[PDB]
């Protein structure tokens, strides 16, 4: 008997929900911010970076924002392990399609790819969920700007602005109230800021503990930039002279 | 969980019980074997005892077939402690890899890579639920391309490493002082010695060794001595008439 | 806690006995065969008004020749009902000739019990929680056969299943006779059927399907033939 | 080689100083003579140090397209940086090797630069010819391949001058490509030449015969 | 012992197997059987079980083979998978060959297909136990057990209250060898009579009764004859 | 024990098998299987005192001794299935043998490969191990006799005369009162019924006709597998019985 | 069947993870350091008895030139993990002319340990590993976890007291540190972990600096280094 | 032979010539791609 | 792989695993489809943050193919799953027959495809209840309700989801055959908002002809609000 060690972890419950997607969504709110937002220039995504030790190497290392494709970035809240399984999965199947059509694949078709491989660990099979929830953004010629939130259970939903991880809800409320259909990307740029610094309980944020990357569309070709210390640098300055 | 002792998985300490229990089923059986290697051969010294089990030793069973000496090919050999079942189903596990590496490579596996990948093979007994752990500690001797001995030695929790003198047996501490000493004493001699004489000694000194560990002298019939070395790469067995003659030259001197 | 093939202390599996109690609900169907064919009859438990009549039929028809009653699981049912359908379709192919009932059930039950896993392949994990009354006309004449979640088929002159199965199987009992005649078989379904219903026997909450003789032919009682047995009835006493 | 003659085709590579230049004809053909297209290009850009002409059956070659943008697209992703152009070579090879018993009827050549860094960087001309199952030949003045190939040998040996500025280099290549596709019947209609250069890259149609 | 007896692949402390003993358990509630044999005859006998008063009794004995046959006690999806088994094997045996079976090896195919599910814990026991009647240069009787063991009997007698049968079996055993066919098949119904409840008796409709014999290929005998040998065996139970 | 105990891939804290164990309790409560090794042949019995009760058997029906090649015995103590299990995988292997290289499977590799068959069985925890103890012999005239006792637990054992089952003790302390390497077969079949009458409480002098198989391999056989004949075994049987019973 | 032993918890944690790190954390000692013209890794390799033969036990291993891998934890993982790792290095190799990248093979390390806590019927590694290399990007020091995550350090120790040894580490690492103050460090660091006396049996050091082939320093190499 | 054997037992009772010619077509075309070198007359009499 | 029965039988003759995928389905949003003449009107509940979450990305009003639609309570990523095998099978049922999927076939391809799930091993049950509205082969407009067991019906008007049960009955008190399409759109407005917080940004309205699905505008639903408040203020 082999059951006994069973867990059940593809089984319902008596309230009708799945114990072990619960558990890792527990996990991703407990893990760091990770914030997104739309502005008419392009999607930003920030993150809070969880410190570990100085001894880190700090340059040219992002651990919470990736790039999935030259169209598609997304941001990163829960197991790291599991976000580079799903990364390097989205990655395939983003040239997967651009191999079968010879165009880039929009951004809501790899959502729901990449939120199918959810749901079918959740449904089939004796293995645990995926520990990890995405803020995908990215960009293409039918549907503009595109913000996604999918979580363990293979739900997604699109959004203007929105957070995932720790305290998510008091950036959601700094959202909220501060967010407007039209930003520049340098407005945009420091509502992160602010947000980031709310979420983290903080007034003057540290560029040591801070990821910014955004994805815009200029020119005909779609850009990503993954700022540094120096140009958060400049934009915490420029922040704290407006606050 | 309520299993961590069941199945091979870490407890809350880090700890895999499984492995500790399966080595203490070694540990049981109640077989001592000594191995010792020399400047140009390696001897490994056994017992010709029935490991402890549910059946006992039997007035009509036949003690010449009681061995926990094998030849995994005609130059590398080895000595298995523990469970019968296993020691047989690693002795043939090592008799396969052998013969699969000299048919892949050209060439003859020696001791120490047969070693590595036995310990190979039970890394995934270690890391896999649904399999148990074979119960069984192994000597493997031979010499390499460089006309070297070469002794290693292996356990049920999947570590190999390569001894001057190593020792299966219930107690380990005071056995691996014996050996010490025993080395030591061989050491201090400094005059070289041709290769017989490096044979005699390091025979002699398997079978003080043991002597020593057991604390009871020791009938030839009850003991199994092989050996190898540059001379006779071949892994051979001695004769119980040589064994009796060790014994009463140690006795004697 | 179990697995699905495991024994009781008393030799039984207790999958197959908790499905033995699954299949106790459900409309309540009755069968009878006589010499001159074989009628279903079934109380139809509509639940709204909304709901569409002909999208719920308690009596189907597994093939030309054969009708069957369902109690117990709906989708386990139907399930099963189509695999039979397939069933004796394939037969009708290889041999050029209408399946015998009794081959159809023994079918059914092979289906039924997959899940044992006692021949390596199965896909079934549970039994079926499935009641069925199969009627019909074959070269031996008309029969009607019950099977049941554990696997074992009978035939019945007269039988029932549903929830008043027990009290249709004793009005059945006491008042069927072999040498009936068709009207007479009609007669005491509807009257089984009225007696055991909880609302007021009508054209509208009673299906019956009819397998006679001379036709071997399965057919399903429209309005017309519904109202003149109910008319035909005795009055209640 | 019938199945070459099909279509035809050919792409030709030179290096310069400091440069680098691929170029090839622009016709689709069908049964050998008959022209479908004039803007059917060879050429292929994998990323800013590196390009691939593929010539051959034309199916063949989209494939091979779009299996190397696949390849290098991925690569590029996992490790942030561009692809080597060494890099690339090999693993054309080895994915033209992978079909060697039912192989992709396509005479590739890659033609790039190399980055080596010291500050600045030093690039270097890299050019490379390859066989339908991916033997390759590593060259440092030219590389032809398609149906022309032996016309394409014989300019190339005869006025090839090496150490040659962007200028020169485009015209030697121009005039080495339009003199061989002049003597093929199934190659032509059309020349395209690029010319790469560490800062930019200079993009050229030829008014060539479209006979 | 309720630690034990969860799966089927789980020795109890004192080394048995607790779920092969329940299936073992599913044979002692089914309907009585008895097979007793002549020097040439083998005569299968059996109850038939009614559910109520309009179902019609069950079958209870099956033709295997042109000289082979079998009864069931248990589960009846059991009995039907092994039926179907031995008629294949039978037939295939038949179509390789163009001979009839060795009835022992067509027995200990059975019983290694009984065997073979008792070793994994993803199967199960069959809870049929099987009585094979045949004629092979002579009678044989075979009874197969969930176990996976089979045994050869002179006379035998399974299902509920078959202790009874047993009984008179072993009280009459000396008289079957030299008997006649009707002696034989007269013995038969008595001991299945002997089962028999006083309250139930033995019809037409819930009797089943076979023969086979040397040259006698698997029979179920009619009803007439039937009724005439119930008949004799009332009258001489009456004396 | 302590749920160590329900598992047979699973130590306990002392490092045992209580699965296997359990297996052991199981043979030593089954029917007598002996082997003895005598001057001119190997003698195998089976003392099957279990089925006493069973009046309707066919007589002498029920054996549990084998050959594999005619020239190889091989009983057991245990379950009927599992042993037949075993016995087809020792033919098994001799087939595979013989189609390899022509000639007869040596009785030592085809013990080593049927105790590695058994213990493959006590390795995973989906799988029921074999609970049974085999007894694989043979003899010729230049080696004499080999007989192994393979173990459920995968051990094999060479001996001159072993026993299992119910009762092996006593049968072993009357067994080695006397050497057979320097007795016959044939008066070995007598000291056997005395062993048996002794020892096994179950078995009169009236049922060891039928509860009891002889096989041997002797010189007299042509050192080939066969069951001793009635006639050979009636006058060994009526000698021990009217022995024991003057004394 | 093959099922998860590795779950959520109800706080959502994985345990099994959390055991495999405690296991790596009770092991003995690993560090490594990135210096301003090469890597280095140490670690404490104690002799349990006179009897065995320290040449046979490898704790500092080679995937390929210019990548090297120390572990703390299980040496039969480690065994398994370093055979996979030149397997994926040749692999690339075979791929694409050239060496194998240290980011690729510890993004590549890292999926294949992620694996098996997820998969069914398996429990995770327990080991970290230090993977240091040097390519065309620079100098690389990796650390892969248990649960299948990798960090880039400038600097970092695995092992027993890895907090303290870290903080002593830390204390005294700048950036612009050379191969001699880096092999000095890494000695130093260990020698105040160790309890007792260190020598140049008791530890191990490998090197990949300035471009050249990765090199195990010999005890003769390490008994000069400890002169001082 | 053995298909009729087999339909004799689970269907209980004998097939007439036209089952036995659908039959004997099935079997036939399974292996029509290899077909058996024989060309059959099957002849009987019927229920009329 | 992995067979382990998930769904097995209770010792009362239950399937415990299909009972809590109904509860799934009761935690599920609400969906009304109300069937008229020659067409349907589906509505469905929205749940969107206000000024944050982009309204037009969830959608539990979909199209399986050129005539069959469908609207769906419970989980939405096994939603996603079932819908996209239910629009494979219509591009499979039409290159099979030449003809389009009616929307019986369908429905029957869901129900088995549920009841599958419920009765394979190493699976769980489809927390999900469908509304599917299609015409037939006779040009014949249908509406057909499927639950996470596997059983299907076929309606008249039919609500699934959270508190199904008072829509179901303000359903069977104020339906009447043959409507029209505005008045069979006040209709399912109205049965909605009996449960679902009168807004118009919370409901998502959609009518099937043989021609297409048209989803209302806002404007009308707005109105149609109004209208519904105007009449609750009237009679309170």
Request: aromatic content about 10%; proline content about 2%.
């Amino acid at each position: 008997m082999a059951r006994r060690y069973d867990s059940r972890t593809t089984t319902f419950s008596p309230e009708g929900r799945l114990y072990q997607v619960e558990y890792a969504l527990e996990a991703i709110n407990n893990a760091s911010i990770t914030i997104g937002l739309i502005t008419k220039d392009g999607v930003i995504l920030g993150a809070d970076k969880v410190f570990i030790s100085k001894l880190i190497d700090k340059a040219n290392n992002y651990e919470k924002i990736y790039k999935i494709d030259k169209h598609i970035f997304c941001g990163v809240a829960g197991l790291n392990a599991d976000a580079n399984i799903l990364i390097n999965q989205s990655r395939l199947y983003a040239q997967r399609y651009l191999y079968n059509y010879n165009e880039v694949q929009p951004v809501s078709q790899l959502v729901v790819q990449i939120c199918d491989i959810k749901q079918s660990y959740t449904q089939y099979g004796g293995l645990r969920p995926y520990g990890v929830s995405f803020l995908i953004g990215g960009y293409d010629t039918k549907d503009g700007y595109q913000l996604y939130h999918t979580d363990p259970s293979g739900n997604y939903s699109g959004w203007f602005a929105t957070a995932i991880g720790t305290n998510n809800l008091t950036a959601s409320s700094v959202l909220k109230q501060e967010w407007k259909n039209d930003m520049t990307l340098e407005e945009g740029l420091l509502l992160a800021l602010k947000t980031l610094a709310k979420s983290t309980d903080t007034e003057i944020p540290k560029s040591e503990k801070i990821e910014l990357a955004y994805l815009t569309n200029k020119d005909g070709e779609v850009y990503q930039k993954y700022l540094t210390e120096k140009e958060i640098e400049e934009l915490i300055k420029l922040y704290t002279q407006k606050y | 969980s309520m299993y961590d002792r069941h199945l091979t998985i870490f407890s809350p300490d880090g700890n895999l019980y499984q492995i500790e229990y399966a080595i203490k089923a070694v540990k049981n059986t109640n077989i001592t074997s000594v191995g010792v290697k020399g400047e140009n051969c390696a001897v490994i010294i056994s017992q010709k005892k029935m490991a402890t089990q549910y059946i006992s030793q039997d007035k009509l069973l036949d003690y010449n077939n009681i061995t926990n000496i094998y030849n995994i090919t005609d130059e590398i050999g080895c000595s298995m402690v523990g469970m019968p079942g296993d020691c047989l189903s690693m002795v043939y596990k090592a008799r396969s890899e052998a013969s699969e590496f000299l048919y892949s490579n050209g060439y003859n596996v020696n001791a120490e890579t047969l070693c590595r990948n036995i310990c190979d093979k039970i890394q995934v007994y270690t890391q896999h639920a649904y399999m148990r752990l074979h119960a069984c500690s192994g000597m493997i001797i031979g010499i390499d391309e460089n006309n070297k001995p070469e002794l290693f030695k292996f356990d049920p929790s999947g570590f190999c490493a390569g001894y001057r003198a190593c020792v299966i047996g219930n107690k380990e501490q005071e056995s691996i002082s014996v050996l010490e000493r025993l080395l030591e004493k061989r050491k201090k001699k400094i005059q070289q010695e041709t290769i017989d004489e490096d044979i005699r000694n390091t025979t002699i000194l398997a079978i003080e060794a043991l002597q020593t560990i057991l604390a009871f002298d020791l009938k030839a019939s009850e003991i199994e001595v092989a050996i190898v070395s540059t001379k006779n790469r071949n892994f051979t067995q001695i004769s119980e008439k040589e064994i009796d003659n060790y014994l009463t030259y140690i006795a004697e001197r | 806690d179990r697995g699905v093939n495991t024994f009781s202390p008393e030799g039984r599996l207790f999958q197959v006995e908790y499905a033995l109690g699954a299949i106790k609900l459900g409309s309540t169907a009755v069968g009878i065969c006589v010499n001159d064919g074989v009628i279903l009859a079934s109380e139809r438990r509509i639940s709204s008004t909304l709901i569409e009549k002909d999208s719920v039929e308690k009596l189907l028809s597994i093939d030309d020749h054969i009708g069957c009653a369902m109690s117990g699981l709906m989708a386990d049912a139907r399930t099963l009902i189509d695999y039979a359908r397939v069933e004796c379709n394939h037969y009708k192919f290889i041999y050029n000739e209408n399946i015998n009932i009794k081959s159809c059930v023994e079918l059914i039950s092979e289906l039924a019990l997959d899940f044992s896993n006692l021949s390596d392949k199965k896909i079934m994990s549970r039994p079926f929680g499935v009641a069925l009354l199969i009627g019909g006309v074959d070269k031996n004449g008309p029969c009607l056969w019950y099977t049941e979640p554990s696997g074992t088929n009978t035939r019945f002159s007269a039988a029932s299943i549903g929830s008043a199965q027990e009290g249709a199987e004793l009005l059945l009992q006491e008042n069927y006779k072999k040498d009936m005649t068709f009207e007479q078989a009609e007669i005491l379904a509807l009257t089984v059927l009225r007696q055991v219903m909880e609302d007021k026997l009508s054209t509208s909450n009673v299906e019956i399907c009819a397998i006679k003789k001379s036709d071997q032919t399965f057919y399903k009682y429209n309005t017309d033939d519904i109202s003149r047995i109910i008319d035909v009835l005795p009055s209640p006493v | 080689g019938s199945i070459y003659n099909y279509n035809g085709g050919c792409v030709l590579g030179m290096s310069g100083s400091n440069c680098v230049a691929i170029a090839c004809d622009l016709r689709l053909g069908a049964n050998t003579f008959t022209t479908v297209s004039t803007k059917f290009s060879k050429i292929f850009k994998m990323n800013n140090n590196v390009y691939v002409g593929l010539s051959g059956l034309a199916t063949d070659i989209q494939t091979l397209y779009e299996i190397l943008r696949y390849r290098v697209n991925l690569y590029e992703v996992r490790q942030d940086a561009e692809m080597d152009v060494e890099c690339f070579a090999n693993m054309l090879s080895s994915i033209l090797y992978s079909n060697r018993f039912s192989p992709y009827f396509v005479n590739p050549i890659v033609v790039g630069f190399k980055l080596k860094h010291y500050k600045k960087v030093n690039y270097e001309p890299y050019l490379t010819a390859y066989d339908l199952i991916g033997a390759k030949c590593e060259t440092r003045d030219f590389v032809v391949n398609g149906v022309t190939s032996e016309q394409l040998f014989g300019m190339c040996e005869s006025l090839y001058v090496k150490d040659q500025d962007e200028n020169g280099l485009f015209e030697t290549i121009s005039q080495c490509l339009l003199s061989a596709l002049d003597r093929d019947c199934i190659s032509g209609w059309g020349a395209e030449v690029l010319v790469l250069t560490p800062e930019k890259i200079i993009k050229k149609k030829l008014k060539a015969r479209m006979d | 012992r309720n630690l034990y007896d969860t799966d089927n692949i789980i020795y109890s402390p004192e080394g048995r197997l607790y779920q092969v003993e329940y299936a073992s358990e599913a044979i002692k509630q089914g309907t009585c059987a008895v097979a007793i044999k002549s020097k040439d005859y083998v005569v299968v006998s059996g109850l038939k079980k009614c559910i109520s008063k309009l179902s019609f009794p069950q079958e209870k004995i099956f033709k295997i083979d042109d000289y082979i046959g079998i009864s069931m006690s248990g589960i009846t999806s059991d009995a039907k998978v092994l039926t179907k088994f031995m008629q294949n094997e039978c037939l295939s045996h038949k179509f390789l060959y163009n001979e009839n079976i060795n009835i022992e090896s067509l027995v200990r195919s059975v019983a290694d297909k009984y065997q073979k599910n008792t070793q994994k814990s993803s199967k199960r026991a069959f809870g049929v136990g099987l009585m094979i009647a045949a004629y092979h240069n002579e009678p044989c009787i075979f009874e197969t057990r969930p176990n996976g063991s089979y045994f050869e009997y002179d006379a035998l007698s399974f299902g509920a209250r078959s202790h009874a049968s047993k009984t008179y079996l072993e009280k009459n055993l000396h008289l079957f060898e030299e008997c006649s066919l009707e002696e034989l098949i007269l013995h038969c119904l008595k001991a299945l009579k002997c089962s028999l409840s006083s309250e139930s008796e033995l019809t037409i409709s819930n009797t089943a009764l076979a023969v086979v014999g040397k040259n006698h290929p698997w029979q179920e005998i009619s009803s007439l004859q039937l009724e005439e040998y119930l008949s004799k065996v009332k009258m001489d139970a009456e004396q | 024990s302590a749920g160590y105990d329900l598992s047979v891939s699973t130590f306990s804290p002392d490092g045992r098998l209580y699965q296997v164990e359990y297996i052991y309790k199981s043979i030593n409560n089954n029917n007598t299987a002996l082997c003895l090794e005598c001057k001119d042949g190997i003698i195998c019995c089976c003392i099957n005192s279990n089925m006493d009760k069973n009046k309707m058997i066919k007589k002498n029906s029920y054996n549990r001794i084998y050959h594999v090649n005619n020239n190889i015995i091989i009983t057991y103590s245990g379950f009927d299935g599992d042993a037949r299990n075993i016995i087809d995988r020792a033919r098994s292997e001799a087939n595979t043998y013989y189609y390899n290289f022509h000639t007869n499977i040596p009785l030592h590799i085809l013990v080593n490969r049927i105790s590695l068959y058994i213990h493959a069985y006590t390795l995973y925890w989906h799988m029921r191990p074999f609970a049974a103890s085999i007894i694989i012999s043979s003899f010729n005239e230049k080696d004499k006799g080999d007989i192994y006792c393979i173990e459920p637990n995968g051990a094999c054992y060479k001996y001159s005369g072993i026993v299992i089952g119910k009762n092996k003790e006593m049968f072993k302390t009357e067994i080695e009162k006397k050497d057979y390497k320097d007795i016959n077969v044939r008066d070995a079949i007598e000291d056997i019924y005395k062993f048996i009458l002794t020892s096994d409480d179950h078995m009169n002098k009236n049922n060891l006709q039928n509860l009891v198989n002889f096989s041997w391999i002797c010189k007299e056989s042509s050192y080939e597998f066969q069951n001793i004949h009635e006639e050979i075994l009636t006058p060994a049987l009526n000698k021990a019985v009217e022995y024991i019973e003057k004394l | 069947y093959s099922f998860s032993l590795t779950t959520f918890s109800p706080t959502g944690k994985l345990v099994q993870i959390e055991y495999a790190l405690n296991r790596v954390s009770s092991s003995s000692p690993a560090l490594g350091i990135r210096a301003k013209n090469g890597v280095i890794i140490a670690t404490e390799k104690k002799s349990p008895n006179e009897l065995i033969e320290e040449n046979s036990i490898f704790k500092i291993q080679q995937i390929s030139e210019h990548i090297g891998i120390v572990y703390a934890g299980m040496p039969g993982d480690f065994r398994v993990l370093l055979k996979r790792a030149r397997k994926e290095a040749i692999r690339y190799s075979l791929q694409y002319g050239s060496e194998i990248l240290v980011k690729e093979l510890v993004k590549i390390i890292a999926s294949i340990v992620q694996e098996f806590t997820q998969t069914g019927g398996v429990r995770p590694f327990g080991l970290s590993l230090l993977i240091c290399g040097v390519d065309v990007y620079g100098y690389h020091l990796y650390q892969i976890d248990p649960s299948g995550c990798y960090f880039n350090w400038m600097a970092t120790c695995v092992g027993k007291d890895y907090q303290n040894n870290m903080s002593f580490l830390e204390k005294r690492y700048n950036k612009d540190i050379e191969i001699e103050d880096a092999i000095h460090t890494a000695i130093l660091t260990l020698k105040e972990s160790y309890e007792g006396v260190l020598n140049e049996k008791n530890i191990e050091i490998g090197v990949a600096y300035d471009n050249k082939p990765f090199k195990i320093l010999t005890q003769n190499e390490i008994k000069d280094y400890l002169i001082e | 032979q053995k298909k009729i054997q087999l339909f004799v037992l689970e269907h209980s009772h004998y097939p007439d010539i036209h089952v036995i010619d659908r039959l004997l077509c099935v079997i036939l075309y399974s292996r029509r791609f290899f077909p058996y070198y024989a060309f059959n007359i099957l002849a009987g009499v019927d229920e009329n | 792989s992995y067979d382990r029965a998930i769904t097995v039988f209770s010792p009362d003759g239950h399937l415990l695993q299909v009972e809590h995928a109904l509860e799934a389905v009761k935690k599920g949003g609400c969906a009304v489809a109300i069937k008229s003449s020659n067409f349907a009107v589906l509505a469905v509940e929205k749940k969107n943050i206000p000024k944050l979450q982009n309204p037009k990305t969830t959608e539990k009003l979909i199209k399986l193919d050129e005539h069959n639609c469908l609207a769906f309570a419970g989980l939405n990523a096994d939603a996603r799953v079932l819908v996209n095998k239910t629009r494979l099978e219509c591009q499979r049922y039409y290159l099979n027959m030449d003809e389009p999927a009616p929307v019986d076939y369908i429905a029957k391809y869901v129900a088995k495809v549920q009841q599958k799930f419920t009765h394979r091993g190493g699976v769980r049950p489809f927390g999900i209840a469908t509304l599917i509205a299609g015409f037939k082969n006779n040009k014949e407009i249908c509406i057909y309700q499927t639950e996470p067991s596997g059983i299907y019906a076929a309606w008249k008007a039919q609500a699934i989801g959270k508190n199904a049960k008072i829509v179901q009955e303000f359903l069977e008190k104020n339906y009447q055959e043959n409507m029209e399409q505005k008045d069979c759109i006040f209709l399912a407005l109205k049965a909605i908002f009996e449960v679902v917080e009168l807004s118009s940004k919370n409901v998502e309205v959609a009518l099937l002809t043989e021609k297409d699905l048209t989803f209302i505008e806002e404007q009308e639903i707005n109105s149609m609000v109004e209208l519904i408040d105007q009449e609750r203020t009237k009679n309170n």
